[PDB]
Ligand binder design. Structure first.
Ligand SMILES: *SCC1=CC(C)(C)N(O)C1(C)C
Ligand SMILES: [Cl-]
Ligand SMILES: [Cl-]
Ligand SMILES: [Cl-]
Length: 164
């Protein structure tokens, strides 16, 4: 298991434009296109992202390219953020993956907002961090995925992702 396999499980793979859990146009492995309710706006973002006239459909290779860029962006974002960087640096490789997962799903600014959870993670108070993380819109709206990510922070193992 690694961050790519982890996010591939959590995000799935779809080669045509679809709506994500929030109802936003997305494609590939959780590549958000736009929050606009306009499909045409989403198709324009897609064409721009891929570099060709796609008409809403991409190849597996193209999906994987966006995915690589997005994972890279999530990590880069953590390292540039003054709230996220110290937490990330303090963590082991497995828990680092859990933090990248959150950033991929909700964005740098969103995760940076979890001030109390971040402090508990920095303190290595794993059970306490896990309890705090669950008190969130994130957990309530995507409880199965949140549970997996939280288990990863609690245990520092891939237990929530094996057999998946
Ligand atoms: S405080 C984190 C941080 C972000 C960035 C602007 C990339 N930096 O140069 C430092 C390490 C200060
Ligand atoms: Cl709490
Ligand atoms: Cl709550
Ligand atoms: Cl879920």
């Amino acid at each position: 298991m690694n961050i790519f396999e982890m996010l591939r499980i959590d995000e799935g793979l779809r080669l045509k434009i679809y709506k994500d859990t929030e109802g936003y146009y997305t494609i590939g492995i959780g590549h958000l296109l736009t929050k606009s309710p306009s499909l045409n706006a989403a198709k324009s973002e897609l064409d721009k992202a891929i570099g060709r006239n796609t008409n809403g459909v991409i190849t597996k290779d193209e999906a994987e390219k966006l995915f690589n860029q997005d994972v890279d962006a999530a990590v880069r974002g953590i390292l540039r953020n003054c709230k996220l960087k110290p937490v990330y640096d303090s963590l082991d490789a497995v828990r680092r993956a859990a933090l990248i997962n959150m950033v991929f799903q909700m964005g740098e600014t969103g995760v940076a907002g979890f001030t109390n959870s971040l402090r508990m993670l920095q303190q290595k108070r794993w059970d306490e961090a896990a309890v705090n993380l669950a008190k969130s819109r994130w957990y309530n709206q995507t409880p199965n995925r949140a549970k997996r990510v939280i288990t990863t922070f609690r245990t520092g193992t891939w237990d929530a992702y094996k057999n998946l």
